[model samples]
Target: ATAQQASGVRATYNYYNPTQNNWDLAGTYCATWDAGQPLSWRSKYGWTAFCGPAGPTGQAACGQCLLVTNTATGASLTVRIVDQCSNGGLDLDYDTAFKPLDTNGAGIQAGHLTVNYQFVNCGN
Candidate 1:
């Protein structure tokens, strides 16, 4: 399917349980704007071209996966989209598909935060 339209943004509650091979490698996943830590793309080569006919062109053209920092706890983590969650909650959005890192900040665990993200058209 094609990328969905970016709109109707809202805040909600959510949890993550990542089971990747490496925690250190997973910790590297964080979100940022044009200044903070750079955003990561699904592809390893570089920015991918936008398959959409209108709008921004390239990886993260609309927005990219980001690491939302918990200003209260000073904790940080990265989140990537693996699926689509659209349930209305207090800590997650409908499109997010990731979980928070563990206490040691190396593995996946259950946690809550005010997270937000942007959408990019990745021609799947």
Candidate 2:
């Protein structure tokens, strides 16, 4: 785990109800340079890593794992920080991580999510 972590923080989706592999933004801005890298892990909901951490600069959070739990839905997922977020919030992957945690689709309408997140060992 990293030195910084957040609980009950803000989260936003990379895209809402993705229609295709629209990873153009992430591919260009990812902090970890994971434009075409293979997914590190996958959750039961087909959730996978590729996100932005709340804190950490440069590549500090790159490749780091996060256990993210949707506060309202009680659904949880694991994601990796491939990019960087501006505030104490998580930038969850669209199709895999974000969509799954949004069990009832409320987060989609609101365009955001409340999550409890923490760093975890990537098990590399």
Candidate 3:
């Protein structure tokens, strides 16, 4: 991704249950981005991914790395745009998303941060 490509791309960020929908921590899985990836991946690491909504107008990207920044705090983290969210901008898994967005500290607003993100790599 180039600098021009890096700029001007942003999204409304939220999270995934990891258990897909059951709300069980020790649960099954969502087909998520792809097959063979374990749900345990969500249990570890920082902002591993953003299951994004359609782009520009509406689109979903796969295996793409993104630099997501919280404009309000200037905090940021890198994550992949993995799958598709049912609605809105993105569905980011919880753990790694909080600190950078600042909303993490306030659970009530934690899943609704405004963020600017860009492509770092694609299907790499």
Candidate 4:
């Protein structure tokens, strides 16, 4: 039997200190993922389709590419999946599964921003 598929998943975005050592200004925004859940395809395949840059490691367990659009700014960009952060507390972690939408390595210190991610499913 194939793995059970989830129709979708919801995630909230937050802004915190980008210093990797600060925990100030951390707050989460409510965002829903009603479209589809992001899938973990065969190692290197998922990232390629999402337009993420080359992974730090050859293995593609994390940092998969996906599109993130800022609802307020109306700006969209391709982002790489980094850490898996299920926000259940008021604190923040830098190694979370999400990052800023700046793919070219700019505007990361602008604090937290609300963004949504919809998984792209390739018919298996």
TM-score of candidate 1 versus the correct structure, residues matched by position? 0.29
Whole-model lDDT per candidate: 0.30, 0.61, 0.47, 0.32
User: For each candidate, how many residue pairs have backbone atoms clashing (under 3 Å)?
Assistant: 12, 0, 5, 4
Can you write out model 4's per-residue Cα lDDT over 36-68, one digit (the tens) per residue?
233332222212112122222223323334545
Candidate 3 residue lDDT tens string, 9-119: 334434554435433223212234333444444433333334333233112454445667766667777665445555545556664454455644543354455667665
How does candidate 2 score on lDDT? 0.61
CA RMSD per model (angstroms): 12.0, 4.4, 5.8, 13.5
TM-score of 2: 0.69
Candidate 4: Cα lDDT at 82: 31
lDDT of 1 at 81: 35
Worst 10 residues of 3 by lDDT: 22-31
Candidate 4: worst-modelled 10 consecutive residues by lDDT: 26-35
Q: Using Cα atoms with residue i matched to residue i, what is each candidate's TM-score against the true structure?
A: 0.29, 0.69, 0.53, 0.32
Candidate 4 stretches greater than 4 Å from native: 1-61, 88-110, 121-124
Among residues 3 or more apart in sequence or in different chains, the pairs in candidate 4 whose N, CA or C atoms overlap within 3 Å are: 15-112, 63-81, 83-96, 83-97
The Cα error of candidate 4 at residue 113, in Å, is: 1.1
